[PDB]
Amino acid sequence: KQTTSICCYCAVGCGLIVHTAKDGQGRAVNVEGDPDHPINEGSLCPKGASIFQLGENDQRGTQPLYRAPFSDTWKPVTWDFALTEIAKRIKKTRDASFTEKNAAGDLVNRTEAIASFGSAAMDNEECWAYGNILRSLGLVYIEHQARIXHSPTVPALAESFGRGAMTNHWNDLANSDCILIMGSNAAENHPIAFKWVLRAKDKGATLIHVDPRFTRTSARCDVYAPIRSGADIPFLGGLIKYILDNKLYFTDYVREYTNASLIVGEKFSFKDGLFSGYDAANKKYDKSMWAFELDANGVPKRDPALKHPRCVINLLKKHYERYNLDKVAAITGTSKEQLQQVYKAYAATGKPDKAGTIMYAMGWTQHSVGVQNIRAMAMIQLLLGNIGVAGGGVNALRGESNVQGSTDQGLLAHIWPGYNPVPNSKAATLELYNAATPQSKDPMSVNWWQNRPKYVASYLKALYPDEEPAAAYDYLPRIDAGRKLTDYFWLNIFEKMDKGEFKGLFAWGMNPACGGANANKNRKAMGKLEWLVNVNLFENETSSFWKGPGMNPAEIGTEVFFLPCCVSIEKEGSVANSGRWMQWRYRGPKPYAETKPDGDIMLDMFKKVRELYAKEGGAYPAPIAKLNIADWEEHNEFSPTKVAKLMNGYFLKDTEVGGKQFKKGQQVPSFAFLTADGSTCSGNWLHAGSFTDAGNLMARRDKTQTPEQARIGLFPNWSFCWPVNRRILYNRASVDKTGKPWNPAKAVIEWKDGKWVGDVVDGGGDPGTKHPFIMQTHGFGALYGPGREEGPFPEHYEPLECPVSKNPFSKQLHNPVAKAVCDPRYPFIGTTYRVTEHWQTGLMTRRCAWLVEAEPQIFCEISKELAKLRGIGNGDTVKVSSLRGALEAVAIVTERIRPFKIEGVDVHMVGLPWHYGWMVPKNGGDTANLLTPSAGDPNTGIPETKAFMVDVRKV
Amino acid sequence: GKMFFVDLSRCTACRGCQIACKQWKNLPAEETRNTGSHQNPPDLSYVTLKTVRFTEKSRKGPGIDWLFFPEQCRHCVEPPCKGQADVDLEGAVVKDETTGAVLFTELTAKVDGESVRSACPYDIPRIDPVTKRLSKCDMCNDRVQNGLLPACVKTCPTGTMNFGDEQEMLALAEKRLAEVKKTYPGAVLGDPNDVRVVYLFTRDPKDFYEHAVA
Ligand SMILES: Nc1nc2c(c(=O)[nH]1)N[C@H]1C(S)=C(S)[C@@H](COP(=O)(O)OP(=O)(O)OC[C@H]3O[C@@H](n4cnc5c(=O)[nH]c(N)nc54)[C@H](O)[C@@H]3O)O[C@H]1N2
Ligand SMILES: Nc1nc2c(c(=O)[nH]1)N[C@H]1C(S)=C(S)[C@@H](COP(=O)(O)OP(=O)(O)OC[C@H]3O[C@@H](n4cnc5c(=O)[nH]c(N)nc54)[C@H](O)[C@@H]3O)O[C@H]1N2
Ligand code: SF4
Ligand code: SF4
Ligand code: SF4
Ligand code: SF4
Ligand SMILES: [Cl-]
Ligand SMILES: [Cl-]
Ligand SMILES: [Cl-]
Numbered sequence A: 001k002q003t004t005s006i007c008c009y010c011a012v013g014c015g016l017i018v019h020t021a022k023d024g025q026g027r028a029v030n031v032e033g034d035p036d037h038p039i040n041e042g043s044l045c046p047k048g049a050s051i052f053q054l055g056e057n058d059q060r061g062t063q064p065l066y067r068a069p070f071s072d073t074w075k076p077v078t079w080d081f082a083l084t085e086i087a088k089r090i091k092k093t094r095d096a097s098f099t100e101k102n103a104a105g106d107l108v109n110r111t112e113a114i115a116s117f118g119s120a121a122m123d124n125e126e127c128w129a130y131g132n133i134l135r136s137l138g139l140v141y142i143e144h145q146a147r148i149x150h151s152p153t154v155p156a157l158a159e160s161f162g163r164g165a166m167t168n169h170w171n172d173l174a175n176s177d178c179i180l181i182m183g184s185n186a187a188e189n190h191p192i193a194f195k196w197v198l199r200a201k202d203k204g205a206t207l208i209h210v211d212p213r214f215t216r217t218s219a220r221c222d223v224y225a226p227i228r229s230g231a232d233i234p235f236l237g238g239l240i241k242y243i244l245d246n247k248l249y250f251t252d253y254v255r256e257y258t259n260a261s262l263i264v265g266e267k268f269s270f271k272d273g274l275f276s277g278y279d280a281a282n283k284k285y286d287k288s289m290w291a292f293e294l295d296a297n298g299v300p301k302r303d304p305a306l307k308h309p310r311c312v313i314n315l316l317k318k319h320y321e322r323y324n325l326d327k328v329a330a331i332t333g334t335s336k337e338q339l340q341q342v343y344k345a346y347a348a349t350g351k352p353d354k355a356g357t358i359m360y361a362m363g364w365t366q367h368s369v370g371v372q373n374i375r376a377m378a379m380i381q382l383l384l385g386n387i388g389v390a391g392g393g394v395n396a397l398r399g400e401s402n403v404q405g406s407t408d409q410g411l412l413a414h415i416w417p418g419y420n421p422v423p424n425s426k427a428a429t430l431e432l433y434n435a436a437t438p439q440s441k442d443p444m445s446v447n448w449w450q451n452r453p454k455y456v457a458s459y460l461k462a463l464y465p466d467e468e469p470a471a472a473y474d475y476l477p478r479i480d481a482g483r484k485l486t487d488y489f490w491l492n493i494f495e496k497m498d499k500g501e502f503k504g505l506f507a508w509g510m511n512p513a514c515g516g517a518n519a520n521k522n523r524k525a526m527g528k529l530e531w532l533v534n535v536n537l538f539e540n541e542t543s544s545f546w547k548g549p550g551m552n553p554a555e556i557g558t559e560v561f562f563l564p565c566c567v568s569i570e571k572e573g574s575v576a577n578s579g580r581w582m583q584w585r586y587r588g589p590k591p592y593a594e595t596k597p598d599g600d601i602m603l604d605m606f607k608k609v610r611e612l613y614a615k616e617g618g619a620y621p622a623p624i625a626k627l628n629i630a631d632w633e634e635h636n637e638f639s640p641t642k643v644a645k646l647m648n649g650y651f652l653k654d655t656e657v658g659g660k661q662f663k664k665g666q667q668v669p670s671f672a673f674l675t676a677d678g679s680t681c682s683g684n685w686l687h688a689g690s691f692t693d694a695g696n697l698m699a700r701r702d703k704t705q706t707p708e709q710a711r712i713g714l715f716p717n718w719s720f721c722w723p724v725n726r727r728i729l730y731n732r733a734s735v736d737k738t739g740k741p742w743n744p745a746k747a748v749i750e751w752k753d754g755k756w757v758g759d760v761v762d763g764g765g766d767p768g769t770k771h772p773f774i775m776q777t778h779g780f781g782a783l784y785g786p787g788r789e790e791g792p793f794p795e796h797y798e799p800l801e802c803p804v805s806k807n808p809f810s811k812q813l814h815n816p817v818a819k820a821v822c823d824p825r826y827p828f829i830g831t832t833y834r835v836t837e838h839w840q841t842g843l844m845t846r847r848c849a850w851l852v853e854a855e856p857q858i859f860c861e862i863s864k865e866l867a868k869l870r871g872i873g874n875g876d877t878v879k880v881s882s883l884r885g886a887l888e889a890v891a892i893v894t895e896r897i898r899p900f901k902i903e904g905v906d907v908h909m910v911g912l913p914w915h916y917g918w919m920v921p922k923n924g925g926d927t928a929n930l931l932t933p934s935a936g937d938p939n940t941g942i943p944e945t946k947a948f949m950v951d952v953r954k955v
Numbered sequence B: 001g002k003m004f005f006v007d008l009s010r011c012t013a014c015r016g017c018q019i020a021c022k023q024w025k026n027l028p029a030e031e032t033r034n035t036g037s038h039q040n041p042p043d044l045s046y047v048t049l050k051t052v053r054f055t056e057k058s059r060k061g062p063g064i065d066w067l068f069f070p071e072q073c074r075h076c077v078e079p080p081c082k083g084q085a086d087v088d089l090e091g092a093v094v095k096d097e098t099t100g101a102v103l104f105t106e107l108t109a110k111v112d113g114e115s116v117r118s119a120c121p122y123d124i125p126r127i128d129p130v131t132k133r134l135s136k137c138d139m140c141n142d143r144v145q146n147g148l149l150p151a152c153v154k155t156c157p158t159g160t161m162n163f164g165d166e167q168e169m170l171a172l173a174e175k176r177l178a179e180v181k182k183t184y185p186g187a188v189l190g191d192p193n194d195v196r197v198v199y200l201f202t203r204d205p206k207d208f209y210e211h212a213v214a
């Protein structure tokens, strides 16, 4: 029979229909698009369109496999044995490594001897449960995908608007009058997005692609502007100057809804590429030097006439005056002609009745000033009145299907679910933890994070419902206050692993043997583990690192457990897409062979650990024994429905809150009704409202829209988005102080007959009574962003090291708050990127013959100019080499790549796909991460995979 | 009967269509290698009824004209393939009068496959070296009879692929041509009066493929 699902690949979130033999009990026989889904309307890219081949695949794992120390083979074992043995490894390693107090005598209750990677590929209920299992075990080294592509940039949106998320959503692109795609190859990497992009074009939108390469995206845009690697901030700074010089900013929006009018204190300055407060010894700023001038109430002073010399807007004008078209054209390599054309077309959206949107994904924002790149986009959007509006926004495109959700559920070392921070060792009590929230004295500033105590208490009640929150607070592990936060993150986990500091690793739904930069180093590091648990669909380069190229299994002592999980269409649960749409999906076919859903694997593993503790005792058993997993279980299995209900939350006593009376056991209708006093639980405050007494709102397949909703495609009854179904964030900025839309033809909200109609208003209150950015301490869209480590305004610092010696904007060449060799044997700028047909490391898509058929081998894209230099012809076999490794690829010689002129010298770019690996297929090639450095970023602690030095030579 | 209108001015070369054809028919994958192109399979074959052809054309200044051609049987109104097969065996090639589909049956194994391929002005038919059966795009004739879009049409995210009754599709082709011709002055329709798969090309069709038009 017929069931609905949601694609397991990218964060567009396309709907599927799955047909299963034997009335829904047997194998899948067909998987195609859901014609009723509002995002894809039945369309699928080749990845979604081949899900049938992913699931009904005789190369999938069938049962658990064990690799003994020094063995060259797998042994098939039972689940009961594999999970008992893993439980025993976990308990031994935890018992041996558990630290109640750190060296300073502070309570930390952690194990630093186990790390976990993964995963954005798991369901939201699975991600939430997984984090809680790992933290109940005392883990702090908990990371996944989001660190690599999203963490380097999301603080830019939090600084600018108050939240880290994509501001609008996919369907909303169709309302744009100008779409700037920059640091994104959306036609290949978010393909169904082009349904809505091309619909904007149909209605007269200009489509602009700013990219070092001409791609399948570029082919369908009106304007293609080449940019040299790392020259984004110059490009965007020039657009800011253009907007200010030509008076194209939306005055009333800027005056009312941005911090343009705020007065910056006298200690702020910038000279010679350095802001005030620079500590040259420790290479950091004293950001207190960037404070606003506060009034007698502690509130920033304001000059709504925008005349005071220290008004944010006047400081901004002065800052960006250097970014003239000649200097910007010279560093970007974009002709002055093309820059003007792009600036004119984009800046035209400053009109109230026009909207422009910016789409970026990963691009090259990995480096130390990627945050400032995105800051610049946020600032351009605030100057043009494009934040909060239909067809506007900063559309930060999420990568994996559920990376939004995996981040939401705290699978990163610095956060619990719902972006509550992991406590540090000096947060000795729950009261100390809660002491840390900044307050506003501005009656118009909502400053919503003041509610955090309710969310932390309700989280502790979800995990430990029979314990008082202050007591349960002592069950969860803490990081050291004294340590750099990046010490707990992705890159340093690999570094620690290579120094032998981990006994165990969970590679849960990731393939770090191909996905991590400098694969040679990481593959050898994995041999320093005592034990590795890999949970995945297929045997892979990680599960089997011990028989990889140049490895001798007889010399590697690591025990490996491979646990085969089931594909998306074989399980139930939710995934949160890029627009925060939390979409429910159903089981079609039964799990293949003896594969299991992640939730079943982790819950059974944890229950066996709990049994071992009950039988034997061990280190600090309370967090393990008292964890509430009974709320997670139905039919002796993991229950997506029950976990989703707990993540929403329910009342643990009769409660009066928000002027309403609730009964013990009722679902919490929204996070507005959470309490700090133990009356409520909620696994994730962002989920409070997703699963109410009305039922599972994530499972709504209702295209009901009012005329106002339909005109812009909000689809408010199709699934549910956080927060509380606000489809367009910051939507109070889309109206004037009387609540009338700037653009009535594309209204997001409007005040009619005493209520907001359209979207759910982002912040309750009558028109003109509240600042539109309710998550900001001060309530404004931040043009000046004094929380950023590199400064309150973006400034060009060269992210390239090897080909640049001079910065034309200042005497500071590189980021002043951030050891590339630049060996002249590797003269070309290597870069890695995706194609439409493959997924991530290709672990999944290299198993799908139809995708291999289209893109069977690693290739190397080069210009005719580089081919000429090296004697390469199209289709030649080439060796691509770096200081870290070497691989062979097929040459693709194409005019889609052109040389950069950098300081009077042609510098060539070499393009590689990172989708290949030694396991499969035959003659596919190995990972481009053999080539990439692991050196990592001082600021972001984020790897370099978009510009790294290589050679390419004919074989 | 029915017609496809294929607006190549909207194609992102996602190859959803190429994959969706194989998923729906459960066709085998070919052994392929990269020989200096994204294009693969390089050609139609007995097991590949659609492939996306990729052509780069130089343009002065930044970027190229990147031409994408998702090739399939044109379902000719008076099909030459059928004229040739019928000489050997009626029933090898038949016309479905409901949809306009030109359909190859198992009896193609008993006709001169080489001659049938040569008769096709679009060089579409392909022979199985083992069974000698001919294959090509069947218009997803069985989905269409059952009120569904062809697999490659439903999957297309861009509006490139369109399908419907011939009157509706010719009206859309005429209207869309006028609109696209604004941006692409060399835009034309492929043999719109002879075939049921009507391509809008953005320039000389023969730049997309040597057999793009008759
Ligand atoms: N088909 C497919 N889709 C995917 C994935 C996949 O593997 N395959 N992965 C998913 C994931 S996890 C993620 S995070 C996203 C990432 O999605 P994208 O960020 O779109 O991915 P890339 O293709 O790596 O890079 C985008 C573009 O950045 C350009 N670029 C490189 N350097 C610069 C620079 O200095 N400036 C500018 N402006 N552009 C630059 C590259 O030329 C490339 O075209 O994609 C997701 N979608
Ligand atoms: N050089 C270079 N390196 C890169 C990148 C780049 O652009 N260049 N991109 C980076 C980025 S943005 C990312 S996000 C990472 C991705 O790195 P990884 O996440 O390690 O990559 P994959 O493992 O290929 O990602 C898909 C995984 O999800 C698994 N999977 C799918 N469904 C399930 C399920 O239900 N459960 C479980 N347990 N597993 C499941 C698949 O089997 C597969 O292992 O790579 C990073 N690495
Ligand atoms: S990979 Fe992304 S665009 Fe393609 S079908 Fe899946 S969700 Fe849709
Ligand atoms: S395109 Fe060729 S194979 Fe198809 S109907 Fe016409 S003559 Fe026959
Ligand atoms: S109409 Fe059907 S058979 Fe023909 S190319 Fe499309 S999917 Fe394949
Ligand atoms: S699915 Fe549509 S956009 Fe994608 S290659 Fe086929 S015709 Fe072009
Ligand atoms: Cl079956
Ligand atoms: Cl054993
Ligand atoms: Cl329990």
Ligand SMILES: [Cl-]
Pocket (backbone or CB within 6 Å): A701, A702, A703, A704
């Ligand atoms: Cl409906």
Ligand SMILES: [Cl-]
Pocket (backbone or CB within 6 Å): A518, A884, A932, A933, A934, A935
């Ligand atoms: Cl390195």
Ligand SMILES: [S]
Pocket (backbone or CB within 6 Å): A120, A145, A146, A149, A398, A399, A400, A403
């Ligand atoms: S991701």
Ligand SMILES: [W+6]
Pocket (backbone or CB within 6 Å): A145, A148, A149, A399, A400
């Ligand atoms: W990613």
